[PDB]
Amino acid sequence: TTALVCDNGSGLVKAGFAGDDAPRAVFPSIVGRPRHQGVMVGMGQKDSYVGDEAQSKRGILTLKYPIEHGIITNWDDMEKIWHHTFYNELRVAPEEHPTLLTEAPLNPKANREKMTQIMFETFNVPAMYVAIQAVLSLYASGRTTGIVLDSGDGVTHNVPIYEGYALPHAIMRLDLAGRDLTDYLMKILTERGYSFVTTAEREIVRDIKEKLCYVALDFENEMATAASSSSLEKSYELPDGQVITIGNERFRCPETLFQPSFIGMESAGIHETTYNSIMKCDIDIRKDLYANNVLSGGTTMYPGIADRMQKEITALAPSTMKIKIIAPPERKYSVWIGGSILASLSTFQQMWISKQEYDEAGPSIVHRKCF
Amino acid sequence: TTALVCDNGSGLVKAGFAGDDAPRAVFPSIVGRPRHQGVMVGMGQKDSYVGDEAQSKRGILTLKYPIEHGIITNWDDMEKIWHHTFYNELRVAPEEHPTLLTEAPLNPKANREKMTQIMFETFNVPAMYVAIQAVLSLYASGRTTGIVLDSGDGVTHNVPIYEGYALPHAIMRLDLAGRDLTDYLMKILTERGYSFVTTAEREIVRDIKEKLCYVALDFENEMATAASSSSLEKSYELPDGQVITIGNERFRCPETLFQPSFIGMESAGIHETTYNSIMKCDIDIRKDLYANNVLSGGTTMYPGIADRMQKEITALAPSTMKIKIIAPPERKYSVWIGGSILASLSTFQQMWISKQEYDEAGPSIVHRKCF
Amino acid sequence: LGTRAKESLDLRAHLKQVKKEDIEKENREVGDWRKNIDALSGMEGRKKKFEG
Ligand SMILES: Nc1ncnc2c1ncn2[C@@H]1O[C@H](COP(=O)(O)OP(=O)(O)O)[C@@H](O)[C@H]1O
Ligand SMILES: Nc1ncnc2c1ncn2[C@@H]1O[C@H](COP(=O)(O)OP(=O)(O)O)[C@@H](O)[C@H]1O
Numbered sequence A, B: 001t002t003a004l005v006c007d008n009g010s011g012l013v014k015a016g017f018a019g020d021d022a023p024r025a026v027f028p029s030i031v032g033r034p035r036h037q038g039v040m041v042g043m044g045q046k047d048s049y050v051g052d053e054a055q056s057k058r059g060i061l062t063l064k065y066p067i068e069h070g071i072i073t074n075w076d077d078m079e080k081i082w083h084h085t086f087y088n089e090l091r092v093a094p095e096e097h098p099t100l101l102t103e104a105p106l107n108p109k110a111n112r113e114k115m116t117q118i119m120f121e122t123f124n125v126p127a128m129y130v131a132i133q134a135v136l137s138l139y140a141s142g143r144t145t146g147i148v149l150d151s152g153d154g155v156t157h158n159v160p161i162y163e164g165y166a167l168p169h170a171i172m173r174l175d176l177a178g179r180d181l182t183d184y185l186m187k188i189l190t191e192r193g194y195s196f197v198t199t200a201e202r203e204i205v206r207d208i209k210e211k212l213c214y215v216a217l218d219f220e221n222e223m224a225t226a227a228s229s230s231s232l233e234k235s236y237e238l239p240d241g242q243v244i245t246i247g248n249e250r251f252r253c254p255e256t257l258f259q260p261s262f263i264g265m266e267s268a269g270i271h272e273t274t275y276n277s278i279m280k281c282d283i284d285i286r287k288d289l290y291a292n293n294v295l296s297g298g299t300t301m302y303p304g305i306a307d308r309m310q311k312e313i314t315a316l317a318p319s320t321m322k323i324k325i326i327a328p329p330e331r332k333y334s335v336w337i338g339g340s341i342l343a344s345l346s347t348f349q350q351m352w353i354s355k356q357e358y359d360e361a362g363p364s365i366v367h368r369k370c371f
Numbered sequence C: 001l002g003t004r005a006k007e008s009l010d011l012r013a014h015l016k017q018v019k020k021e022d023i024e025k026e027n028r029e030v031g032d033w034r035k036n037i038d039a040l041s042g043m044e045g046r047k048k049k050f051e052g
């Protein structure tokens, strides 16, 4: 039979059968209970709208993501999300399909063990396998080397790989991602008068960020230009009218990636953690990693980031090496495409964690040889 | 058995069995004791004529409404009105019929508790339920969202509802209604020479208001036109002859709705309390409320109000949203039609306040789960 | 998109049912009563008693 390549993510759940080009169903991972009282009788009001249904009734719900930073903080809601994904968005019972979840690097063990225990006890799948979210993104590019920066919505991690041999001592995981950029944008919008507070209006700020923000090639020059002319002010129409005008908030929101001091984080930007991740590698594979830097994940879709990052790394790196940044147009679904490719391989067909194996060793089987 | 859908109102009591299209008996709610001496013996003169009987002998009575502004100020008279409604206008003993009263929002608790205590002790009904007068008017329109402006004769209230979830923090109750318009019309008629003082002549002024007054689309232009031409002066024949001619009093009486400063009230008109009630709602359900504005209640029957209100709200609201005002031709009985629909539902059949429940918790049961 | 749009109409179908089918509970109230005439035949009394 065919395998189910699910990809929990944090912000958008992407799923679909193995062997295709794009995920079959992509929908936000939010579960929102209603918060008001409700007076109409017999309206058929449910107790929790999940997935894309709660992005249409969000006016009277309190949306809450079940995955904070890679890790899962609310297991009941995550179980509800998985149940919805299997039964309503794909309509395939899990009793007859292997599953291939994905997990960020350096995550707590208990999260992974609980994930496999749920998949084997509640949904009762035949066999499931958990894979690191960066190796898949490297599969999708058709490479076999390269250092991949997978800046998702929950957590940004940077896994270097050479000739198929991952370097476990050079993984640099940073917890700045799309959600913190949404919060920072929502916080700097208040400097013009627009106040978004409700958890429903966070979605509106996210839409503003997606449609308007861009990464500046040079920050100081853009700050000077936006403060003199008015060629940058782009307007946007809220879900009820009252258009708003975003000035130099456009390139200040995604600039937080390269200067995490804006949101008070100490660490260095995504332009310098990649160079540090390279320098921890051996001295003889640094040229190949320099030449095959891969971008993935949703947050790396800002217009103009593949040039800013290349300029920064070229500034840091030695002058002789060639710096090349691979930015495929299908960046958002790169991890899932790689997952489909991996699940479609014949050599991989014996790596699944078969159910009888789980019955013999318990949920701690995932840390064992079947990784 | 069938349920009795009574609707106390203030000015017209509307009642009838559940499941029909129109109330069976509609009659003014006035109780008038005779005031003169009376010399004929054996004429069979009663001590209080209630309902529609006192609108024919009103020449020698002192009519007094038992409901001032939604609240009930004279419980003995209200009990008399209910007794008349049950026994003479419907001729069904209340011992064998559930009842569904209606109550304005934000009313004193003691009024509701006394109402249920009367219905359970004096008339001894099997089970009664109290419902907010605006949710029913929303039922009758066949919608499930929308903000309903129910401008009755006692009190005008504006309850917004979305997807069946009422928003309790956005109810704007204003005490200007048809009765104050009658008093203001009676007060401005004195500018031509016609003096109505007796409580019986208030009914004549009410008839004048119903048959002649209309809401102007633009107030200043109408004031200028009525002061130059004479195309507006419509005449009306009193109950004894001596026709009267109403000039620019025609559109000045119902204009008080949009400018409550005429009768000295501070608050804003019904055109601006609706917009304020909308703006208190969440930012994502404002478009739906804009598109589904519902009118109900008797006082919204003035010819030309559904255009003036739309013009005013379109002036206030953002230019992109579409403003639509639902004004069904059966406006007056909208609340009662909705009450019939609600009482006819199967899902609602277990929400009644059964008598044994009242015996166990006292009259304060109404504020509890059985709302 | 078609199924999502059709969902709203399916939900509104119940509201339409509640609005329409329920009015059939009773509609004979339009029938008026007798209000008969006398044709100068209902005059069978004198000015004897008026209190009763
Ligand atoms: N076109 C875009 N432009 C800018 N940011 C985007 C765009 N699309 C998605 N994002 C950001 O990326 C996030 C989605 O990232 P995604 O790759 O789905 O995370 P995950 O790894 O959990 O699947 C969204 O929250 C949004 O903030
Ligand atoms: N055709 C009409 N035109 C103008 N005003 C009307 C008309 N019919 C009723 N009204 C006003 O509405 C009042 C009746 O309102 P109603 O809806 O019966 O109040 P309630 O909510 O107490 O039932 C009357 O007092 C009258 O002033």
Ligand SMILES: [Mg+2]
Residues within 6 Å of the ligand: A009, A010, A133, A150, A152, A153, A297, A298, A335
């Ligand atoms: Mg991801």
Ligand SMILES: [Mg+2]
Residues within 6 Å of the ligand: B009, B010, B133, B150, B152, B153, B297, B298, B335
């Ligand atoms: Mg009313």
